[PDB]
RNA sequence: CGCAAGGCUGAAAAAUUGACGGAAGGGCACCACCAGGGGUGGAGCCUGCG
């Protein structure tokens, strides 16, 4: 199995064991430590909880769950203590997704993205992006419908297209401990699988999420349609010919 | 009970404007980048000099 | 180089499509169909400018 | 909360041991018997200031009366920039008010060795109204020139290397009305974060004292009273040995706020005496007293007086740096080092030092004879965050 | 006053570093050319 | 301290500082006086006598 | 009048800009203020540093014209935001302060 | 170096562990120092995701590189008696 | 306000990481071109 | 690497050609006269500026 963010993992670290939950993340390209959701397979990635501090370049193991009855290879991850401190930086992705509403040749006007006009007055002059790669600026929050505004783009966007800003926000892992004292007995948070399967609620799955094949057909354009005063300004050896 | 239930709108990753509350920005605290030069301000040290 | 990466390095991201909530609207249009409606676009104003010219 | 102690003696050395050991302190009854001014002192509660600015993590509380704190400490992050400042190489300000009678290395010492053990490096710069980078007559501190050359060379003995250390000056101020005040900024930079500090030893003796160098300095007063200076501790000085060479320094005046003013009007001299075996100096320092006006050259003779009694009483250190390098003797690794102290040398403050480690969880000290041997075991601490890259 | 010292000791001690304590036309073809 | 160079300078005679150096006379200043007495409230006052045939207070 | 010749005008008046007097002229003068009214001077003939409307007052009430500075308003502003908001910019994610009851 | 093919090292620091781009030469090099001879020298790691196995400290086989940054002579061979390319592969675990 | 602090801190920390890398890598090339010169002169004299 | 990089010190002239005017006479101006026209300013809405 993969091992999730958030869910929790006993850790072999020091002489204590101790079942805590980290927060995985990577190190986006050396930029800002972007928190992912799984663990990469195959890959190093950073992890980051709550517990002991240790001297850093001390290796550790790291088990699920310490039963007889797993059928296969108990340990789950490894690694070693790359440093400590208290208050990380952890940073995640989020997207305010909205749609256009009027669009002109470059400024358009987008709907669906914000809720009033002070929230667009703290977004002013934010980097906003459409899905095709067009970027554009939010330019000015728009009176009469509340919630709308007007972005300058690069070139004209389509009715089609989802217009994207990408914000980050900071996630902070959980400080929770639990101490694996066996010989005395002590409680084993489950994971998110044994959780659901015990208390019967299916895993969230969007159907906008997963992903489709996509029926694109042939990109025809139009001609090319000259106006009326140019295809009769134009000299006789350019001129139009159409019969 | 946390970790079964529905992630809050900042930890979803994709946040329309059905999602969230009403002003609902102005209580976080993000980063994102900007575009293009802002025009400097006059001030009193800029026209001293 | 290309025998330094495994078959997981190699393997390919999917493209979303467009949410079935806003299908009626078309195709959801992403660099490859935004480069050939920018390709199309200057095209037919390139010969429109030379058009002015003359 | 957990542990505990009393006094306001050796203060800052309490809050820095129990930073770098990580132990939560409870510090009772700073001022029981001053009715006029009890509780914390402002260079106190301005060192508090700059310990949770430089930490990450440390919750300090102060008393309703001012006379209980108690502090849990946190990591000695530096100056990151995601938490501490902007830029990895911004420096971050501390300003200390006006009413500060301290000087300057006051501030210093425990921030020098408490450096050397931080996560990113350190950056910071003392501005504000009271920031006298002289002597005082106060507690007899030293002064900047005495601090540089007298007490960073032993981190270059530990192997902290002073090729990284940047401490400048950019004003220099003395005291100016009465004790409070100053003025002149600085700004002093570690750039060199080590793992754990080496075991030293400096056990053989060190005997020839090969030559004396010095710095006296005027701070708003002509620029013939370090000449006249010059002369006297050169006329002291000359019967014993043929090379003391003393720089003169000089700086106009540093204006504070109330229009500003300018403060910090005096001049001191600071003398080193280098040994030719090791990293062994001696130093003394000597500053005219701020309203006083007393002669250049009773100061030229005082401070050459000192510096022969220090080179009469010390074994291989100072009592003015003796804390420091046992301190950083005791963060060193699991071994024993061995420093050669007089037996004049012995002060309360260090013996404080030696109840404040045995406190704390350190080992005690083995001390025997040669001047004695006092012997330290590390513990073997360290630094705790640094990126093992 | 004999304190003037150096400049090489000035660089030493007045600096912002501390000092560490671990130092101690001929001939016709040329002329043409 | 009244100079040939047509200006007085006012010292602290704590440390011997300067306190402002004041171009004060069109020539070359004779003489200066302060009046003994801080029992008017003003003892901090001195006169000055120059070759420009003015007295300042 | 033009605002040179005004200042002329007015330079003249404050004997700053006159001609060259005599010794006998300079006699005149120490036989027989001028910063308090060039600052004045200085104020009034740079209007631009403050906001003032042309019209003057909309109705007259008689009961016994500036108003406004951006300049030093956008300075001020300007220097409440560096120690608020850049402050709290730079202490992003800072835990634990020190807590003074007194 | 040395008269061998093949020198130990250790270790010291992992330069240009901050570059931005993922496969930058700068991001591959890592100075170790020489056990047989003393001096510091630098050497490729051969892939930017197979530099997380090389840590701090660690005895470190190199060898010539015969084929961004043209001079660094060496690349890392084997890590702590485990082939580099073996840790790459994920057919065994470093001892530490 | 923003804007401005965000561009003034962009553009410092874009040009402080530009310089010492530039000098890492100039380091680096420098003392490994100037080894294996050295190895090449000492070979090529065998 | 060397020089730059040592504090009679302590914040706020030129002129044989220059400084300032006055009187007379010209030229121009919807920031002037003359002849008219039109805004704003009264009530409400709101960008912006203070």
């Given at each position: 199995?993969i091992?999730?963010?958030?869910d929790?993992?006993?850790?072999?670290?020091?002489?204590?064991?101790?079942?805590?939950?980290?927060?995985?993340?990577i190190?986006?390209?050396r930029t800002?430590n972007?928190?992912?959701?799984?663990?990469?397979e195959?890959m190093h990635?950073?992890?980051?909880?709550?517990?002991?501090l240790?001297?850093?370049?001390?290796?550790?193991?790291?088990?699920?769950?310490?039963?007889?009855?797993?059928?296969?290879?108990?340990?789950?991850?490894?690694?070693?203590?790359?440093?400590?401190?208290?208050?990380?930086?952890?940073?995640?992705?989020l997207?305010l997704v909205?749609?256009?509403?009027k669009?002109?040749?470059?400024?358009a006007?987008?709907?669906?993205?914000?809720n009033?006009?002070?929230?667009?007055?703290?977004?002013?002059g934010?980097?906003?992006?459409?899905?095709?790669?067009?970027?554009?600026?939010?330019?000015?929050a728009?009176?009469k419908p509340?919630?709308?505004?007007?972005?300058?783009?690069?070139?004209?966007?389509?009715?089609?297209?989802?217009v994207?800003?990408?914000?980050?926000?900071?996630?902070?892992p959980?400080?929770?401990y639990?101490?694996?004292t066996n010989?005395?007995?002590?409680?084993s948070?489950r994971?998110t699988?044994?959780?659901?399967?015990?208390?019967?609620?299916?895993?969230?799955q969007?159907?906008?999420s997963?992903?489709?094949?996509?029926?694109?057909?042939?990109?025809?354009?139009?001609?090319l349609?000259?106006?009326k005063?140019?295809?009769?300004?134009?000299?006789?050896?350019?001129?139009?010919?159409?019969? | 009970?946390?970790?079964?239930?529905?992630?809050?709108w900042?930890?979803?990753?994709?946040?329309?404007a059905?999602?969230?509350?009403?002003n609902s920005?102005?209580?976080?605290?993000?980063?994102?980048?900007?575009?293009?030069?802002?025009?400097?301000?006059?001030?009193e040290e800029?026209s001293?000099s | 180089?290309?025998?330094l990466?495994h078959?997981?390095?190699?393997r390919?991201?999917?493209?979303?499509?467009?949410?079935?909530?806003?299908?009626?609207?078309?195709?959801?249009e992403?660099?490859?169909?935004?480069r050939?409606?920018?390709?199309?676009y200057?095209?037919?104003?390139?010969?429109?400018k030379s058009?002015?010219?003359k | 909360?957990f542990?505990?102690?009393?006094?306001?003696?050796?203060?800052?050395?309490?809050?820095?041991?129990?930073?770098?050991?990580g132990?939560?302190?409870?510090?009772?009854?700073?001022?029981?018997?001053?009715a006029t001014?009890?509780?914390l002192?402002?260079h106190?509660?301005?060192?508090?200031?700059?310990?949770?600015?430089?930490?990450?993590?440390?919750?300090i509380?102060v008393?309703?009366?001012?006379?209980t704190?108690?502090?849990q400490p946190?990591?000695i992050?530096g100056?990151?920039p995601?938490?501490?400042?902007?830029?990895?190489?911004?420096?971050?300000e501390?300003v200390?008010?006006?009413?500060?009678?301290?000087?300057?290395?006051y501030?210093?010492?425990?921030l020098?060795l408490?450096?050397?053990?931080?996560?990113?490096?350190?950056?910071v710069?003392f501005?504000?109204?009271?920031?006298?980078?002289?002597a005082?007559?106060?507690?007899?501190?030293?002064?900047?020139?005495?601090?540089?050359?007298?007490?960073?060379?032993?981190?270059?003995?530990?192997?902290?290397?002073?090729?990284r250390?940047?401490?400048?000056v950019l004003?220099?101020?003395?005291?100016?009305p009465?004790?409070?005040?100053g003025?002149?900024?600085?700004?002093?930079?570690?750039?060199?974060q080590?793992?754990?500090?080496?075991?030293?030893?400096?056990?053989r003796?060190?005997?020839?004292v090969?030559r004396?160098?010095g710095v006296?300095?005027?701070?708003?007063?002509?620029?013939?009273?370090?000449?006249?200076?010059?002369?006297?501790?050169?006329?002291?000085?000359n019967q014993?040995?043929?090379?003391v060479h003393?720089a003169?320094?000089?700086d106009p005046?540093?204006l504070?706020?109330?229009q500003?003013?300018?403060?910090?009007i005096?001049?001191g001299?600071?003398?080193?005496?280098?040994?030719?075996?090791?990293?062994?100096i001696?130093?003394?320092?000597?500053?005219?007293?701020?309203?006083g006006?007393?002669?250049?050259?009773?100061?030229?003779?005082?401070?050459?007086?000192?510096?022969?009694?220090?080179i009469?009483?010390?074994?291989?250190?100072?009592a003015?740096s003796?804390?420091?390098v046992?301190?950083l003797?005791?963060?060193?690794?699991?071994?024993?080092?061995?420093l050669?102290?007089?037996?004049?040398?012995?002060?309360?403050?260090?013996?404080?030092?030696?109840?404040?480690?045995?406190?704390?969880?350190?080992?005690?000290?083995?001390?025997?004879?040669?001047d004695?041997?006092?012997?330290?075991k590390?513990?073997?601490?360290?630094?705790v965050?640094?990126?093992?890259? | 006053?004999?304190?003037?010292?150096?400049?090489?000791?000035?660089?030493v001690?007045?600096?912002?570093?501390?000092?560490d304590?671990?130092?101690?036309?001929?001939?016709?073809?040329?002329?043409?050319? | 301290?009244?100079?040939?160079?047509?200006?007085?300078?006012?010292?602290?005679?704590?440390?011997?500082?300067?306190?402002?150096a004041?171009?004060?006379?069109?020539d070359?200043?004779?003489?200066?006086?302060?009046?003994?007495?801080?029992?008017?409230?003003?003892?901090?006052?001195?006169?000055?006598?120059?070759?420009d045939?003015?007295?300042?207070? | 009048?033009s605002?040179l010749?005004?200042?002329?005008?007015?330079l003249?008046?404050?004997?700053?800009?006159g001609?060259?007097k005599s010794?006998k002229?300079?006699r005149?003068?120490?036989?027989?203020?001028?910063?308090?009214?060039?600052?004045?001077?200085?104020?009034?003939?740079?209007?631009?540093?403050?906001?003032?409307?042309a019209?003057?007052?909309?109705?007259?009430?008689?009961?016994?014209?500036?108003?406004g500075?951006?300049?030093?308003?956008?300075?001020?502003?300007?220097?409440?935001?560096?120690?608020?908001?850049?402050?709290?910019?730079?202490?992003r994610?800072?835990?634990?302060?020190?807590?003074?009851?007194r | 170096?040395?008269?061998?093919?093949?020198?130990?090292?250790?270790?010291l620091?992992?330069?240009?562990?901050?570059?931005?781009?993922?496969?930058?030469?700068?991001?591959?090099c890592?100075?170790v120092?020489?056990?047989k001879?003393?001096?510091?020298?630098?050497?490729?790691?051969?892939?930017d995701?197979?530099?997380?196995?090389?840590?701090?400290?660690?005895?470190?086989?190199?060898?010539?590189?015969?084929?961004?940054?043209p001079?660094?002579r060496?690349?890392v061979?084997?890590?702590?008696?485990?082939?580099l390319?073996?840790?790459?592969?994920?057919?065994?675990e470093?001892?530490? | 306000?923003?804007?401005?602090?965000?561009l003034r801190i962009?553009?410092?920390?874009?040009?402080?990481?530009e310089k010492?890398?530039?000098?890492?890598?100039?380091e680096?090339?420098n003392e490994?071109?100037?080894?294996?010169?050295?190895?090449?002169?000492?070979?090529?004299?065998?």
């Open positions: 199995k091992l999730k963010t958030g929790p993992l006993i850790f072999s670290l020091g002489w204590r064991r101790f079942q805590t939950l980290p927060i995985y993340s190190w986006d390209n800002r972007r928190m992912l959701k799984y663990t990469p195959h990635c950073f992890g980051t909880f709550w517990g002991p240790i001297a850093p370049n001390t290796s550790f193991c790291c088990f699920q769950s310490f039963s007889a009855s797993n059928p296969g290879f108990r340990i789950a991850a490894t690694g070693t203590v790359l440093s400590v401190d208290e208050s990380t930086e952890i940073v995640k992705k997207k909205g749609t256009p509403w669009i002109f040749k470059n400024t006007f987008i709907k669906d993205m914000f009033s006009s002070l929230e667009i007055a703290k977004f002013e934010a980097a906003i992006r459409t899905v095709s790669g067009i970027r554009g600026q939010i330019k000015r728009l009176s509340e919630g709308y505004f007007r972005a300058t783009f690069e070139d004209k966007i389509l009715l089609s297209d989802i994207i800003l990408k914000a980050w926000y900071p996630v902070k959980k400080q929770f639990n101490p694996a010989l005395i007995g002590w409680q948070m994971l699988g044994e959780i659901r399967r015990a208390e019967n609620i299916p895993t969230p969007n159907p906008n997963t992903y489709r094949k996509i029926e694109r057909p042939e990109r025809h354009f139009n001609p349609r000259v106006p005063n140019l295809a009769a300004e134009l000299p006789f050896k350019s001129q139009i010919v159409q019969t | 009970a946390e970790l079964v239930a529905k992630r809050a900042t930890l979803a990753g994709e946040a329309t059905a999602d969230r509350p009403v920005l102005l209580g976080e605290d993000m980063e994102f980048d900007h575009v293009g030069k802002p025009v400097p301000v006059v001030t800029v001293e | 180089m290309s025998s990466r078959a997981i390095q190699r390919a991201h999917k493209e979303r499509a467009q949410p079935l909530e806003r299908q009626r609207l078309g195709i959801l992403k660099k490859k169909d935004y050939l409606r920018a390709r199309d200057k095209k037919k104003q390139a010969v429109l058009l002015r010219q | 909360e542990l505990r102690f009393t006094g306001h003696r050796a203060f800052t050395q309490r809050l820095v041991l129990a930073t770098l050991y132990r939560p302190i409870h510090i009772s009854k700073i001022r029981s018997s001053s001014n009890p509780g002192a402002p106190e509660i301005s060192f508090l200031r700059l310990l949770e600015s430089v930490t990450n993590g440390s919750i509380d008393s309703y009366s001012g006379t704190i108690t502090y946190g990591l992050t100056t990151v995601g938490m501490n400042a902007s830029l990895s190489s911004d420096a971050i501390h200390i008010p006006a009413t500060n009678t301290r000087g300057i290395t501030f210093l010492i425990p020098a408490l450096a050397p053990f931080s996560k990113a490096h350190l950056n710069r501005t504000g109204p009271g920031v006298i980078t002289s005082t007559h106060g507690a007899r501190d030293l002064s900047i020139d005495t601090f540089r050359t007298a007490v960073l060379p032993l981190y270059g003995l530990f192997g902290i290397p002073p090729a250390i940047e401490l400048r004003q220099r101020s003395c005291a100016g009465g004790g409070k005040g003025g002149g900024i600085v700004e002093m930079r570690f750039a060199s080590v793992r754990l500090p080496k075991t030293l030893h400096l056990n003796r060190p005997g020839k090969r004396i160098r006296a300095y005027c701070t708003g007063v002509a620029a013939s009273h370090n000449n006249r200076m010059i002369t006297a501790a050169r006329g002291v000085l014993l040995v043929s090379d003393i003169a320094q000089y005046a540093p504070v706020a109330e500003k003013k300018k403060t910090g005096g001049f001299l600071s003398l080193v005496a280098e040994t030719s075996a090791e990293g062994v001696y130093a003394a320092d000597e500053v005219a007293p701020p309203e006006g007393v002669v250049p050259e009773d100061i030229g003779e005082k401070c050459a007086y000192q510096l022969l009694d220090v009469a009483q010390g074994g291989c250190v100072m003015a003796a804390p420091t046992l301190t003797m005791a963060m060193g690794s699991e071994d024993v080092g061995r050669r102290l007089g037996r004049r040398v012995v002060s309360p403050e260090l013996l404080e030092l030696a109840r404040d480690l045995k406190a704390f969880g350190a080992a005690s000290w083995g001390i025997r004879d040669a004695l041997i006092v012997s330290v590390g513990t073997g601490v360290g630094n965050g640094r990126k093992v890259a | 006053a004999d304190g003037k010292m150096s400049k090489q000791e000035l660089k001690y007045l600096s912002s570093r501390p000092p304590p671990t130092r101690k036309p001929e001939d016709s073809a040329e002329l043409l050319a | 301290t009244s100079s040939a160079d047509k200006n007085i300078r006012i010292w602290g005679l704590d440390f011997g500082d300067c306190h402002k004041l171009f004060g006379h069109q070359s200043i004779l003489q200066v006086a302060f009046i003994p007495h801080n029992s008017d409230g003003n003892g901090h006052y001195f006169f000055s006598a120059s070759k045939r003015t007295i300042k207070y | 009048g605002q010749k005004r200042l002329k005008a007015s003249r008046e404050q004997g700053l800009i001609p060259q010794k002229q300079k005149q003068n120490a036989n027989d203020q001028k910063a308090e009214a060039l600052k004045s001077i200085r104020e009034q003939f740079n209007p631009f540093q403050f906001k003032t409307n019209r003057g007052p909309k109705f007259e009430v008689t009961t016994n014209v500036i108003k500075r951006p300049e030093l308003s956008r300075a001020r502003s300007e220097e409440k935001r560096r120690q608020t908001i850049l402050v709290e910019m730079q202490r994610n800072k835990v634990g302060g020190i807590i003074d009851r | 170096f040395g008269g061998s093919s093949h020198a130990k090292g250790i270790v620091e992992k330069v240009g562990v901050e570059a931005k781009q993922p496969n930058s030469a700068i991001r591959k890592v100075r120092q020489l056990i001879n003393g001096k510091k020298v630098t050497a490729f790691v051969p892939n995701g197979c530099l997380n196995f090389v840590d701090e400290n660690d005895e470190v086989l190199l060898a010539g590189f015969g084929r961004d940054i001079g660094v060496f690349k061979v084997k890590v702590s008696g485990v082939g390319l073996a840790l790459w592969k994920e057919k065994k470093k001892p530490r | 306000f923003i804007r401005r602090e965000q962009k553009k410092e920390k874009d040009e402080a990481y010492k890398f530039k000098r890492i890598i100039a680096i090339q490994e071109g100037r080894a294996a010169n050295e190895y090449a002169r000492e070979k090529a004299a065998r």
